[PDB]
Amino acid sequence: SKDRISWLGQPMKIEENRTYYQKVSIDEEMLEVGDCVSVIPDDSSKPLYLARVTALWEDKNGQMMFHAHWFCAGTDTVLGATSDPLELFLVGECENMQLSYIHSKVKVIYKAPSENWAMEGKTYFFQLWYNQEYARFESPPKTQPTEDNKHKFCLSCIRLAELRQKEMPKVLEQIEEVDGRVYCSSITKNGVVYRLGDSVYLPPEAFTFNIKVASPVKRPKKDPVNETLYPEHYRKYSLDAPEPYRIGRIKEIHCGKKKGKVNEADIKLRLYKFYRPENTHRSYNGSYHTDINMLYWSDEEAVVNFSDVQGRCTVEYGEDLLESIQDYSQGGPDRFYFLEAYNSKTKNFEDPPNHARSPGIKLPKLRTLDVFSGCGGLSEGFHQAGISETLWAIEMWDPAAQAFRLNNPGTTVFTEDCNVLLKLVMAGEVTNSLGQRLPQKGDVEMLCGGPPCQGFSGMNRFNSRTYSKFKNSLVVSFLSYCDYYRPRFFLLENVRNFVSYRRSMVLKLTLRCLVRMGYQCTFGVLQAGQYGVAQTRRRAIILAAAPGEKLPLFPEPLHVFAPRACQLSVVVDDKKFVSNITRLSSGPFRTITVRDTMSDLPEIQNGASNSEIPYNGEPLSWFQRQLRGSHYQPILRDHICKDMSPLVAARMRHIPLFPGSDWRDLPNIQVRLGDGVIAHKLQYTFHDVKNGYSSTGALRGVCSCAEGKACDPESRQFSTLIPWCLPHTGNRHNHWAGLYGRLEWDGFFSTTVTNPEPMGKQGRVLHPEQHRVVSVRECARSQGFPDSYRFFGNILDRHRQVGNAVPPPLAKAIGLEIKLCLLS
Numbered sequence: 001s002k003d004r005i006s007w008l009g010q011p012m013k014i015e016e017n018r019t020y021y022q023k024v025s026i027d028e029e030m031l032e033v034g035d036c037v038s039v040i041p042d043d044s045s046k047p048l049y050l051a052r053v054t055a056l057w058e059d060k061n062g063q064m065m066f067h068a069h070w071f072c073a074g075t076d077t078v079l080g081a082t083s084d085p086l087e088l089f090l091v092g093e094c095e096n097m098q099l100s101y102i103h104s105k106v107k108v109i110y111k112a113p114s115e116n117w118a119m120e121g122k123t124y125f126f127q128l129w130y131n132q133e134y135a136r137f138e139s140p141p142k143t144q145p146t147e148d149n150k151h152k153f154c155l156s157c158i159r160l161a162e163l164r165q166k167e168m169p170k171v172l173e174q175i176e177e178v179d180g181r182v183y184c185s186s187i188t189k190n191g192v193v194y195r196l197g198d199s200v201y202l203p204p205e206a207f208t209f210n211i212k213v214a215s216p217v218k219r220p221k222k223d224p225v226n227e228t229l230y231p232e233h234y235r236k237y238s239l240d241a242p243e244p245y246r247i248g249r250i251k252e253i254h255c256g257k258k259k260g261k262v263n264e265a266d267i268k269l270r271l272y273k274f275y276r277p278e279n280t281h282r283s284y285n286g287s288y289h290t291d292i293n294m295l296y297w298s299d300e301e302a303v304v305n306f307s308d309v310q311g312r313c314t315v316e317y318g319e320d321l322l323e324s325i326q327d328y329s330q331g332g333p334d335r336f337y338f339l340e341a342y343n344s345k346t347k348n349f350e351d352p353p354n355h356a357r358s359p360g361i362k363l364p365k366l367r368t369l370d371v372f373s374g375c376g377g378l379s380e381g382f383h384q385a386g387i388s389e390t391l392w393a394i395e396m397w398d399p400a401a402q403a404f405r406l407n408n409p410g411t412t413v414f415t416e417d418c419n420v421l422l423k424l425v426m427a428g429e430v431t432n433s434l435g436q437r438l439p440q441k442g443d444v445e446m447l448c449g450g451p452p453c454q455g456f457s458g459m460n461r462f463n464s465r466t467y468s469k470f471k472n473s474l475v476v477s478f479l480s481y482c483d484y485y486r487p488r489f490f491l492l493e494n495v496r497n498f499v500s501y502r503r504s505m506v507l508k509l510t511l512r513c514l515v516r517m518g519y520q521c522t523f524g525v526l527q528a529g530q531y532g533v534a535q536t537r538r539r540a541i542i543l544a545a546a547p548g549e550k551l552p553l554f555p556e557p558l559h560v561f562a563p564r565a566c567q568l569s570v571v572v573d574d575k576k577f578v579s580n581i582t583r584l585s586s587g588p589f590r591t592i593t594v595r596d597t598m599s600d601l602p603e604i605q606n607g608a609s610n611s612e613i614p615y616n617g618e619p620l621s622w623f624q625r626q627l628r629g630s631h632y633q634p635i636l637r638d639h640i641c642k643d644m645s646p647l648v649a650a651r652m653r654h655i656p657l658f659p660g661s662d663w664r665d666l667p668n669i670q671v672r673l674g675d676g677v678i679a680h681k682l683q684y685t686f687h688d689v690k691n692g693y694s695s696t697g698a699l700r701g702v703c704s705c706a707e708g709k710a711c712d713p714e715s716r717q718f719s720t721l722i723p724w725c726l727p728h729t730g731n732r733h734n735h736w737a738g739l740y741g742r743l744e745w746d747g748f749f750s751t752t753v754t755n756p757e758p759m760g761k762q763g764r765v766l767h768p769e770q771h772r773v774v775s776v777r778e779c780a781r782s783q784g785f786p787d788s789y790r791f792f793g794n795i796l797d798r799h800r801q802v803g804n805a806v807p808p809p810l811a812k813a814i815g816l817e818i819k820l821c822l823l824s
């Protein structure tokens, strides 16, 4: 508390409502703008309030005030209790307070990164600005005070202003008013400038197409079946991706008025509607083969609110292009094209109107060390983004290492445990026992890897031994690499639940470590499906950038994907964290289906083992054109599949081809197997108290536990076409949906695993039509691997390599964001 408060010196500036001072005397103690201060919280449980004094003034009401730019205590960030008690973080929170509330002046030191940062391997301090919505720690702003604002300079305030300014709609150029409306030639929002003739992204529900579309005649309940023949059919008891953006060319821009001035909150756009192929009568079955970025011109017009505009996109008439459709297309983000118009009325494709026509810096590649390199999915995505050149890779497992070499003739691959390699460099060795030159300080500019985080699954609290386990884990080793090499950029990829293992303590300790090193850092979850692959794959991503750099953003989703598979947010101690991703529903491109992925692949049989066979056909999908290339390439590699036992071979043959088919479609029949053995009939000799009798008067239990009792030891039945254990525990596991399931042509892969098993956790691994599990190549296609991408070892080795990889299209997306950080 402060009672004796008097100004010192001449006022710095006198506004109309405030008189500013540079110094004040509080209880005989000098205080200055720039000083830091503590304030005692009313809530005794909260950490002490801490602020920088950015300004001093008197209000007309006789109050002597300061502006408090608050600090954030470590425990109020993701770090929580892992954070240094003495570390503060900057935040965009500030306010006006009565000087008399100050409890004490405090010393707050700015711990700046040493000028020799690359070689580094009781007072409060700070180093980073904390963004609490995205969990980003970043370098403090470089912005300096001007003479004009030197008296009130507040980073927090300046930041909020810049946000507001960027966020808000503004009209750049007015044309004329017509009937209570100002028409404009140019506007802007969120940093994007939209002019007449530009194209725009809009939510699916922004407008409607004029084409008539008869509601799909669908089908009544499927054909009924005999429940003794199909005893598990009843357990089937009880097209979910949104649409991609609407797209339109801007024809006019007009807004209302307030006080004789433009109402910018009321800007409206009139657009020429564009048709995606699947928007025409062609629908989807008519667009399987079309480019994902091809559109159709239309003279249909729509009025839309600027507020709804989700972004800007380029749409060009094919013929006006100075380059090839392909070159133009792969040239930049948000690039579309058309070659025809579409008449909603005659359902015909005319030539585009005349008015639809036009008017008639090389970056250094980052030298990259890829730890836990695997077969190189991560390094491949980066290469594609053009941001890196992986010069060094470490992979303990020989086959994967070899695979890496096959794809990267130029990188020195150390097939070795990362722990012993690091010791070797610590040992001063220039070389490993094989003459291979170890990477040193300065060599490594970008460090990436996916450290297997094996233990830690039991999400109970961190104990003393647990902390030791972690200190000896591979994620820590990876951090050791970061600490020694001090790279410009750091990427740690992992399974989604990296963020939640042991109450998120794994996540918190690695962020704590990155912060301790002085790194900018953040984390997030991404869904590979949203970057152009036909698979559900949520992954964790920890990003870090060296003091002098920009911290990259997480890439905006490119493809629409099943919402249920796009739960990207993570809760840490009840706090919900999200990434900067803005596209929370729709997106530019349609979802990539199983069909796009592997409809061109020649037919193979269970156990097929010929690793080199010819494509006997052309790419059918856009996706297949990308992955197979335009280049001459006649050889289809690794189109081989596991050789399932005769029993399992039999089960597969008996899963029907209807979309969604799985083990519950299996007939309860005896089969003579391909060995001379027998798949027997499963027998039901217990009541399932929950499921009752069937229509054939049959019982439905295969164990005593189906009647509420304990399990009969004798219960288990062997060598039976319908796996015994599935009805056994079906009730407690949503009837094991998906097990022995066929992929749907219209659907997507379940998470691509190291060893696809019909009876594994996610067992929807059967080809949609053929009687076998998916091939190594097919799995590679479910990830984003080009067809030329090589793998190595026996079939299981290759599956392992493919299931382990980061899909290159996901990696590429991340790569481009880092690329943004390389400008200037």
Ligand SMILES: Nc1ncnc2c1ncn2[C@@H]1O[C@H](CSCC[C@H](N)C(=O)O)[C@@H](O)[C@H]1O
Residues within 6 Å of the ligand: 371, 372, 373, 374, 375, 376, 377, 378, 379, 394, 395, 396, 397, 400, 416, 417, 418, 419, 449, 450, 451, 452, 474, 801, 804, 805, 806, 807
């Ligand atoms: N101690 C260790 N040292 C080096 N590599 C290890 C290791 N322990 C496990 N690994 C390897 O780390 C890999 C993690 S899988 C990551 C693959 C890579 N990100 C990709 O996109 O392809 C596995 O292949 C595993 O063999």
Ligand SMILES: [Zn+2]
Residues within 6 Å of the ligand: 067, 068, 069, 093, 094, 095, 154, 155, 156, 157, 158
């Ligand atoms: Zn402020």
Ligand SMILES: [Zn+2]
Residues within 6 Å of the ligand: 703, 704, 705, 706, 710, 711, 712, 715, 728
């Ligand atoms: Zn039982």
